[PDB]
Amino acid sequence: IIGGRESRPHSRPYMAYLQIQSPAGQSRCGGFLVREDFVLTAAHCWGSNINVTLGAHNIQRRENTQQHITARRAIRHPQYNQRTIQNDIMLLQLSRRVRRNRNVNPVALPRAQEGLRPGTLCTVAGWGRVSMRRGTDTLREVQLRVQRDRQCLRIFGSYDPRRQICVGDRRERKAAFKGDSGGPLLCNNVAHGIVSYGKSSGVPPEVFTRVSSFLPWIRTTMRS
Ligand SMILES: *P(=O)(O)[C@H](CCCCN)NC(=O)[C@@H]1CCCN1C(=O)[C@@H](NC(=O)CCC(=O)O)C(C)C
């Protein structure tokens, strides 16, 4: 997270830290708990073996609130396009359910086909880097402002307003960064987006997967 602040510890109990493939440091992403046995994250964060950490603040310490569970299944959206980075969403079925408490619980998802008005303030959080030079051991967050689709539509070639969201005022040095992928975009306490991609510079506006466009796929994957 660029330009954010450290989150109050354990105030976002749905946040997940993903350790993708061995050794310990092959690749990392964020994610969020949507049910006691399912984690939603970005499809581009896919890996052969994924270790999910829940209940964390400082990921470099053995905290008693932490729960480590390996993903039993990593279900990428069937239409995920790695080239255009379209349909960048994936469900992680945990090998075992989380033991639900004040430090570990699901986030509310939006209703299907639920849009978002440009100018709306949303919060994004993660353990990604804060700059090109340094990272963070603890959870951070930042408030980003939703942009008109029209704006990303002329910056990113494969942008699709119906499945993605344009986020971030270019006039502020606030954005998600490397390692924050898969993290939630919470607008009015509901997980509306998933960190996906942007300019390498980290210069807004960036692109988030629009969660409400995938509800039927979400409900079918978790039910079945
Ligand atoms: P996530 O931690 O893996 C990362 C989050 C970037 C947040 C930027 N505000 N996403 C990420 O690296 C995605 C998936 C792989 C490709 N992504 C990149 O974003 C790349 N950028 C683009 O393709 C767009 C480049 C542009 O039009 O200038 C780079 C950053 C690797």
10 is a catalytic site residue: no
44 is a catalytic site residue: yes
> In the chain, what are the domains?
1-12+107-212 (2.40.10.10), 13-106+213-224 (2.40.10.10)
Q: Resolution to 1 decimal, in Å?
A: 1.9
Given 7, 57, 88, 180, the catalytic residue = 88
Where b means 16+ CB within 10 Å and e means fewer, 120-137 reads eebbbbbbbbbeeeeebe
Count of residues in the chain: 224
**Tokens read off for 35:** 């049910």
Approach to solving: X-ray
DSSP assignment of 87-112 equals S--EEEEESS----BTTB-PPPPPPT
Q: Which residues line ligand 1 (CB under 6 A)?
A: 29, 44, 85, 128, 175-181, 195, 197-200, 202, 206
**Tokens read off for 13:** 């109990």
Closest atom of ligand 1 relative to the 2 alpha carbon? 9
**Tokens read off for 55:** 């209940």
169 is a catalytic site residue: no
